[PDB]
Design a protein around this ligand. Structure first.
Ligand code: ZN
Lengths: 952, 20, 20
């Protein structure tokens, strides 16, 4: 026996593909623990999830647990340095985050595998003896104020909080979880609250061991990890806090049959239908709400959405279960509305009820359940291995819900068929407890309530009894048929044997006028899956704003037309991505290799013989006008958008595209497609469970389909242009300034252009980014608290690179001078660090760059960047890392002095300032007169362009 | 970090804001 | 039309970055 451990669980059920090794257990103080041993992992990780969150905030200090969660990162009795924790991680290739939901607070990090204990020890102190320092608390309260600021003007957050504002206001559900400066400082001061005590009190009340789950993943054996967890976590105190429950639904009688008309920020049109339901978590072995979500949310022939779409009322639908908290849940059905749709809310809902009646009428269907069960069994068998940090974070939360032995499978494996539960839930999707919300600009002016926390304008009505009646009498509508057997369900899982000529990187196995094929058989993951990626180049996708619009519209219209047939493939784990790029088009097809040729074929064939529905065209066109307009409401950090336009040779503005959009007529589109398709080049990466012969074959089928149906011919080597980047003058500085009309913050992007990419240029910039990475966060946010969003790092585009800084702030772009201030802090800091501190940073970047991909598509993505950027440097990580180890402090000081210091002979600075809707401290250096960019075209015309990088 | 239920076109939109 | 993981539950910042 062991006193510290209440038990060890039995064998923890894992997929037989999972080579990782597992032990669950429960400590004497009640923490549920999963241990994960992966002797091959590069980074180790842990997470702790406390079953407490904002639903438990004092009614009089909204946001206290979100705030607590910020405060734990800022010092404890054992590690009092304010940023000890984020600094330790940073020097050891890790990072860390945390989130607070209504019932949970989840904290996770990763780190170099050699430093689990160091990281883990620092982390445990969050749960033992946080300082909540007086002065930290004063600063950090601004960061939370900024998180909320950011959300104020966003349609999702306003809807999310509005839902809670309109249930029982007595119910914890109507609390405001983010908090802000007002609720967390101003008003508590007005009321004589000592927030440091309130944090100490709440931590002390609720951070009990009996409400915690911890997961720890590392190279150590299961025994070693056990000792480690026992040692750092046994001492967490147990206060037997009863777990909070909410058996009473926040929506009672008077909340049902309500209609809400809401004014959005963006020009969007949506309908939200919602029914209150009991908590279904406990029925996870059968999962009735998933079953029904699958049916009502179906998109195949026969489906609810098929008809709403055919009547030109909705374009997309989502349905199924939505969590509330322990005690109450929701079932939703939500749709976007066309303009016609907006005038037929009533009929759309009646269709929803007609579709629900059809389910009552046909009863529960075991064959549907069997499909859901097989698909999840297979998903489970062959799940991609996860990145440690997400994985620990996830298991940590679900340890609160499932037996130890089941945590890994609980959410996949279905067991039990439950015509009773399916029928019970189905008996709640009735007009007598429906809630209806319509979001539309047409309610501008018409409304009379204002939600307090966000300012959302809305109106509230009883749904008229006569309407409830008509919905109550919905009869079968023969447009609605359950779906049929799903023919895309895969059945061939054989992993083809590894070829004698297979290679560790992709091999160019086809190099023709028409196509360039890169290919690799998977030699690492051994799952039955593959990725097939294609760039199609046509100079016409982007020749001008109008072509650009057309490429875009074409591809949307296509996807819209494939949707019904493609949906089944997607439930079966076969999916695809298809969009227009500044060069032409991008197609990715991913999932189980088994039926993939079928899907690829149907796509290219549709692409090449497409016929457009006039009605569909008109709808999609209108959604896209709105989409362009709505950009006006994106967040001020937009600064990135304008830099991207200022720095790239060719790029059309959202304004230009919008103008050109009225000239897009049906006749004009039909004409464009054959035009676009007539000369292409294709560069493909085929990668996964496939042979060279299969790959050549798949490539050639794409080619032949295009030739047959669209007479495609090759492009000339020269028309395969890449675009270039603007070359900034030595010693100059340009500012381009604009206003965000919607949000009341600023944003700024500051770019220090350095030089072309290459081994040495790259690694100089990367080491530098690594050394300044947590310091910038720590100074510009944590100390100076200039905004929530504060980012810094390398910028790469068009083969050039530089250092950038992005901040969203309430102070004006001021921001500049503080970054410049910071920049000097850093030279001096680089001078003052020990060699060993220098070399740890090298080591840390090295671990980051060499971290091996855990799954097929992570490996695909690295290769695809080498290909789409035409560097083709597949072994860049070893090369660049070898060179990295070479570098010294002098190199970095020289580099900084040459390209980055305020008086550097090759400084190249551009700043985008986005002003707000209205518009101790280190010493900021004096700055030059900037040059104000007046006009984007001119600014480009008056400067050189860089060369493009040479291939590998 | 707070954040809330990402449904349909709210996940597409919200997830653009995380990824420049 | 089927509710996604980030719709049905309230996701971490980590789960969101995961599709980028
Ligand atoms: Zn936060």
């Amino acid at each position: 026996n062991n006193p510290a451990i209440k038990r060890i669980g039995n064998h923890i059920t894992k997929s037989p593909e999972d080579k990782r090794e597992y032990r669950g257990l429960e400590l004497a103080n009640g923490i549920k623990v999963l241990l994960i041993s992966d002797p091959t992992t590069d980074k180790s990780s842990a997470a702790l999830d406390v079953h407490i969150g904002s639903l438990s905030d004092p009614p009089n200090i909204a946001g206290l647990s979100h705030f607590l969660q910020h405060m734990l990162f800022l010092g404890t009795k054992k590690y009092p340095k304010e940023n000890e924790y984020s600094q330790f991680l940073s020097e050891h290739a890790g990072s860390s985050n945390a989130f607070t939901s209504g019932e949970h607070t989840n904290y996770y990090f990763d780190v170099s595998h050699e430093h689990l204990e160091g990281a883990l020890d620092r982390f445990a102190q969050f749960f033992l003896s946080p300082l909540f320092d007086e002065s930290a608390k004063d600063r950090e309260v601004n960061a939370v104020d900024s998180e909320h600021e950011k959300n104020v003007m966003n349609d999702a957050w306003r809807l999310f909080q509005l839902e809670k504002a309109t249930g029982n206001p007595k119910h914890p559900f109507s609390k405001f979880g983010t908090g802000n400066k007002y609720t967390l400082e101003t008003r508590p001061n007005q009321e004589g609250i000592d927030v440091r005590q309130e944090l100490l009190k709440f931590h002390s009340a609720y951070y009990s061991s009996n409400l915690m789950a911890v997961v720890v993943l590392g190279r150590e054996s299961l025994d070693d990890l056990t000792n480690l967890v026992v040692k750092l976590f046994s001492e967490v105190e147990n206060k037997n806090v009863p777990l909070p429950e909410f058996p009473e639904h926040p929506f009672q009688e008077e909340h049902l049959k309500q209609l809400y008309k809401i004014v959005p920020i963006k020009d969007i049109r949506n309908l939200y239908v919602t029914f209150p339901i009991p908590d279904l978590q406990k029925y996870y072995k059968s999962n009735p709400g998933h079953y029904l979500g699958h049916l009502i949310g179906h998109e195949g022939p026969g489906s609810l959405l098929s008809e709403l779409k055919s009547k030109g009322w909705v374009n997309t639908l989502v349905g199924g279960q939505k969590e509330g908290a322990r005690g109450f849940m929701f079932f939703i059905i939500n749709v976007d509305l066309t303009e016609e749709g907006l005038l037929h809310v009533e009929d759309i809902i009646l269709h929803m009820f007609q579709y629900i009646q059809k389910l009552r009428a046909e009863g529960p269907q075991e064959w549907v359940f069997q499909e859901l069960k097989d698909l999840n069994a297979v998903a489970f068998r062959f799940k991609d291995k996860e990145r440690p940090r997400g994985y620990t974070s996830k298991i940590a939360g679900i340890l609160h819900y499932y037996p130890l032995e089941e945590v890994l499978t609980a959410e996949y494996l279905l067991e039990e068929f439950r015509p009773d539960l399916i029928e019970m839930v189905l008996d709640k999707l009735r007009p007598e407890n429906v809630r209806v919300a319509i979001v539309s600009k047409s309610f501008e002016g018409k409304t009379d309530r204002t939600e307090e926390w966000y300012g959302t304008q809305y109106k509230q009505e009883a749904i008229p009894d006569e309407v409830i009646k008509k919905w109550q009498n919905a009869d079968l509508n023969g447009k609605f048929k359950l779906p049929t057997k799903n023919e895309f369900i895969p059945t061939n899982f054989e992993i083809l044997p590894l070829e004698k000529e297979a290679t560790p990187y992709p091999a160019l196995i086809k190099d023709t006028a028409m196509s360039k094929l890169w290919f690799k058989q998977d030699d690492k993951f051994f799952l039955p899956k593959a990725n097939l990626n294609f760039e199609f180049f046509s100079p016409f996708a982007y020749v001008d704003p109008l072509h650009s619009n057309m490429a875009y519209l074409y591809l949307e219209l296509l996807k819209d037309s494939l949707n019904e047939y493609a949906y089944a493939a997607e439930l079966a784990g076969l999916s695809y991505d298809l969009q227009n790029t500044i060069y032409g088009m991008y197609l990715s097809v991913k999932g189980y290799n088994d039926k993939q040729p079928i899907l690829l074929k149907k796509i290219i064939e549709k692409m090449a013989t497409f016929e457009i529905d006039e009605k569909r065209f008109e709808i999609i066109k209108e959604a896209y006008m709105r989409s362009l307009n709505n950009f006006r409401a994106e967040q001020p950090h937009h600064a990135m958008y304008y830099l991207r336009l200022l720095m790239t040779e060719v790029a059309w503005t959202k304004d230009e595209l919008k103008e050109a959009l009225d000239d897009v007529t049906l006749p004009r589109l039909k004409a464009f497609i054959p035009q676009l398709l007539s000369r292409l080049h294709i560069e493909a990466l085929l990668h996964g469970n496939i042979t060279k012969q299969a790959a050549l074959g798949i490539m050639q089928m794409v080619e032949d389909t295009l030739i047959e149906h669209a007479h495609t011919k090759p492009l000339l080597p020269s028309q395969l242009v890449r675009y270039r980047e603007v070359q900034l003058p030595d010693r100059g500085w340009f500012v381009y300034q604009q206003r965000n009309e919607v949000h009341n913050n600023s944003g700024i992007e500051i770019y220090y252009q350095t030089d072309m990419q290459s081994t040495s240029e790259n690694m100089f910039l990367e080491l530098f980014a690594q050394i300044i990475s947590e310091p910038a966060f720590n100074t510009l946010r944590t100390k100076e608290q200039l905004g929530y969003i504060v980012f810094s790092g390398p910028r790469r585009a068009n083969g050039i690179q530089g250092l950038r800084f992005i901040i969203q702030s309430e102070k004006p772009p001021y921001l500049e001078s503080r970054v410049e201030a910071f920049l000097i802090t850093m030279e001096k800091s680089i001078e003052d660090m020990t060699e060993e501190a220098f070399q740890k940073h090298i080591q840390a970047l090295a671990i980051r760059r060499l971290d091996k991909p855990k799954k097929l598509s992570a490996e695909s993505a690295k290769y695809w960047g080498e290909i789409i950027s035409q560097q083709y440097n597949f072994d860049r990580d070893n090369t660049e890392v070898a060179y990295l180890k070479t570098l010294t402090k002098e190199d970095i000081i020289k580099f900084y002095k040459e390209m980055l210091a305020v008086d550097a002979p090759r400084r190249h600075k551009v700043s985008v300032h986005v002003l707000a809707r209205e518009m101790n401290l280190s010493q900021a250096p004096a700055l030059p007169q900037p040059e104000v960019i007046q006009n984007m075209t001119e600014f480009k015309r008056g400067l050189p362009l860089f060369p493009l990088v040479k291939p590998h | 970090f707070v954040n809330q239920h990402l449904c349909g076109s709210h996940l597409v939109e919200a997830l653009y804001l995380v990824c420049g | 039309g089927i509710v996604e993981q980030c719709c049905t539950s309230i996701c971490s910042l980590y789960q969101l970055e995961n599709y980028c």
